[PDB]
């Protein structure tokens, strides 16, 4: 509630959180190089969650505090339709793969098995990189002057 | 219940989890090089949690499923006193620093402020590396490779 404050606060959010998101995606790449695909999916999950958190905070000064994936994605696509392109459902395997990441937070550290191919991970990386590019753009476009 | 099964299962656990723990500690180093100290603390928290989870699974085929830190540490030190050396309280800053990591799972991704110095992180890295060395050793020492003598 105040033109100059609202700018300060939206800059603070975006600078605080977008770099966490980029870094999680980098950690994932690192872990793929290591051969630890399950923990890379976990980092991809975090890259994506953090990216949405960053989006919602920057543009509305609020984020759920569950930080639920479906929820934060829901809310974010609800605030700007351009974000739906990120996760196309024109092939089934795209949902299989996406669900692997979603399962990865809860499982992945803890389950005895957690199956994810190289191909799935390459796809989730491409998709995360577009989410990050777009989210970065949409956050800059929110410039109060 | 079964000498050869119990060995298979304890190897499976340790091989499944110890490498997650090492890898979290490595990720932390990587993030320290990147200048992202808050997320490195987060990975350190996971390196430690995963290490204790690995310990308790290997030796007892069970782990809480809270995966609470105080808890899993409590349980793990309760089963082998050697693990108390890992987190000495002979300086106050050691408790400040440890608490930073503990707070790091919950905060750190989410909070606006999360303060952790280079010195703190270096100390948490050294400590995590001893936990991992010790845990690795205690897991190998758990060998029912003898108790399947009765073949």
UniProtKB/TrEMBL annotation, chain A:
Ranges for domain HEPN: 18-138
Domain of life: Bacteria
Protein name per Swiss-Prot or TrEMBL: Nucleotidyltransferase
Full-protein interval shown: 151 to 295 of 308
């Amino acid at each position: 509630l105040s033109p100059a404050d609202a700018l300060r606060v939206a800059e603070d959010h975006f600078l605080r959180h977008m770099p966490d998101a980029r870094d999680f995606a980098d950690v994932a790449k690192y872990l793929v190089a290591k051969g630890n695909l399950h923990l890379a999916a976990f980092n991809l999950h975090q890259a994506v969650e953090t990216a949405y958190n960053c989006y919602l905070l920057t543009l509305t000064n609020y984020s759920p505090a569950s930080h639920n994936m479906k929820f934060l994605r829901g809310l974010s696509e609800g605030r700007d339709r351009r974000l739906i392109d990120i996760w196309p459902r024109d092939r089934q395997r795209f949902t299989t793969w996406y669900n692997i990441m979603n399962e990865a937070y809860v499982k992945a550290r803890y389950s005895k098995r957690f199956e994810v191919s190289e191909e799935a991970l390459t796809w989730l990386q491409e998709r995360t990189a577009e989410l990050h590019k777009l989210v970065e753009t949409l956050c800059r476009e929110h410039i109060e002057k």
